[PDB]
Amino acid sequence: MTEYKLVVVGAGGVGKSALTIQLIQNHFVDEYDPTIEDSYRKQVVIDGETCLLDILDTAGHEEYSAMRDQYMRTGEGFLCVFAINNTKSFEDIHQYREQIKRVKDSDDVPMVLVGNKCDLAARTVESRQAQDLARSYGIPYIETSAKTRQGVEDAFYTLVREIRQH
Amino acid sequence: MTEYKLVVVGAGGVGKSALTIQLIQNHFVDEYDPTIEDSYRKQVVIDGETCLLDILDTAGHEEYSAMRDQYMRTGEGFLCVFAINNTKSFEDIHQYREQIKRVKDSDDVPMVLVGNKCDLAARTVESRQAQDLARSYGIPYIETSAKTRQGVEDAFYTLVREIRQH
Ligand SMILES: Nc1nc2c(ncn2[C@@H]2O[C@H](COP(=O)(O)OP(=O)(O)NP(=O)(O)O)[C@@H](O)[C@H]2O)c(=O)[nH]1
Ligand SMILES: Nc1nc2c(ncn2[C@@H]2O[C@H](COP(=O)(O)OP(=O)(O)NP(=O)(O)O)[C@@H](O)[C@H]2O)c(=O)[nH]1
Ligand SMILES: [Mg+2]
Numbered sequence A, B: 001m002t003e004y005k006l007v008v009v010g011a012g013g014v015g016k017s018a019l020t021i022q023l024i025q026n027h028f029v030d031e032y033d034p035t036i037e038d039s040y041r042k043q044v045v046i047d048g049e050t051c052l053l054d055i056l057d058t059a060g061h062e063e064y065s066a067m068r069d070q071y072m073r074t075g076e077g078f079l080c081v082f083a084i085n086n087t088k089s090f091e092d093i094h095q096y097r098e099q100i101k102r103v104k105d106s107d108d109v110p111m112v113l114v115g116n117k118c119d120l121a122a123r124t125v126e127s128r129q130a131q132d133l134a135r136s137y138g139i140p141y142i143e144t145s146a147k148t149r150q151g152v153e154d155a156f157y158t159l160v161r162e163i164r165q166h
């Protein structure tokens, strides 16, 4: 079947693992549990086609330097996550977008900027500015909540459809 | 606020009204009830921005000839619906795609092909062929169910994001 190689990327503590666990195992993890690397494979059906989602869950900071080169090389699509209450995680997004362009020799590489944690009332990153960043890059922007499950299927599936259309 | 002028288009009986009612009033209509025109305005929030969705619910066949010219003129985005158990409604999609290009003087006009009724087990339109049609046009393809609510927020919101990015 079609496999879709997704890698979820972004800063430490943004919720990429609680995103991937909501999708894969339907429940919110409120644990402190930093990732070196976790891989989830799941036979799924998206718009009538069956496919296996092969998600790679990555570390926020880690040793992880040109040591990211290797997974952004194999990955077809990227979820670029930041949290809407962490202004620096929003700013580090240019670090990941460019390095993914550098290792991929591409300017269009299927991607989607995910503003996570939109259940929390004290936010510091307005959607207007986050939507501009995503329009600057020619990329979809989607706000999520791994607490509430708001938009997690939407981030994942829009990204698969971005790969389908590239 | 941003308003988003959506018009839902496609053949008679495909479920465009049960799509719009699922979205607007959360319930499945299993009624025989043909549309001349219905308009739904709803303040909503999509990815942190508040906006009013101004949906125009249209007739499948009707008198409706160059009398469609007027709404495809005002509309910003289109949901092009067919049902996955009605092969001719899948084929009439080129009628609507071209006329929307003709009245809009455009080749990229925000749109999304919706394969409705994916709860029903006897289907005649494979997703593979429907996904090709949507890749031919450079358009998202999304399967829905107004019975089950599967994918109705996904058809509507992907379409708003298509307008945001155009
Ligand atoms: N309120 C709220 N909390 C969330 C959300 N997603 C994750 N969290 C919380 O945020 C913290 C970090 O979550 P985690 O998913 O481990 O983040 P990570 O970005 O994957 N961390 P790492 O970079 O080290 O791999 C946890 O306490 C988790 O419960 C969300 O949508 N909203
Ligand atoms: N099983 C199933 N039935 C549906 C679905 N959507 C609509 N229906 C049924 O299909 C029939 C036609 O629905 P309707 O929404 O009125 O279609 P329309 O395309 O809007 N008709 P018109 O072109 O005349 O405006 C109704 O009996 C309705 O209950 C769906 O997702 N699945
Ligand atoms: Mg993690």
Ligand SMILES: [Mg+2]
Binding pocket: B016, B017, B033, B034, B035, B057, B058, B059
């Ligand atoms: Mg109708």
